[PDB]
């Protein structure tokens, strides 16, 4: 779920900058869900 979304964010036609923000936001849910 996380890896499938992170890898999809990666191939998007957006800036690197935005790729990282969305990446950070996604694994923010994964970390809070597991904490």
């Amino acid at each position: 779920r996380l890896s499938e979304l992170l890898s999809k964010i990666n191939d998007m036609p957006i800036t690197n900058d935005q790729k990282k923000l969305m990446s950070n936001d996604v694994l923010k849910f994964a970390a809070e869900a597991e904490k």
Partner: antibody
Amino acid sequence: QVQLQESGPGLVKPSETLSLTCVVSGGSFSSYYWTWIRQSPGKGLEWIGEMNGNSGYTNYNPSLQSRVTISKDNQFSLKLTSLTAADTAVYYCARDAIVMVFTDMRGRVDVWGPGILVTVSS
Amino acid sequence: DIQMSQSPSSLSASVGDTVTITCRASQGISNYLAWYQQKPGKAPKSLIYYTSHLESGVPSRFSGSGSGTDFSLTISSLQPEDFATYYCQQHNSYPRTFGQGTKVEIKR
């Protein structure tokens, strides 16, 4: 180490299709984004596009979007159609960053092929 | 398309000189600037890839700095193998775009 090598005809006619193939050595094709880049004396280095080495998902240069295809055949190819003299250039395949996750190496190339001179002329 | 402008285009230097090459981007690029080296008849070689990050094997005399829109490739104590063309490349946005190159030539 990983090595790339271009192959294909280096003489193409104006309206007909440019076809090039890049085979990957080292054995890590499905982990990286793979690219095509071309260099012209008039327009310099141009990023043609990228391809997700696992899925085949692509992102093209808008200036090339409507007539460019990058695809899996450790081998991937570039097809450019409806050519003109302005497509005359040395074409390189190259390795971008990993597909799995964003890394900061995203969008730059680390390894290049030797390059292929494609001549567009009648 | 983000336009990339290198200054100077040509440059005369000697062995042991410190040389710097400017690369300007038309917009911000979140400091995603790469540098490449190219010698005649050869494919370019990757030098630096996130303003400052040296590619493996690259001599430490090559250093990258800069921010916002202005970036610098600095070669400290130039060597005979460094005489070549250097290109910058933004790798933040699509499409990826390159400068016109800066040719480092031998002064005599």
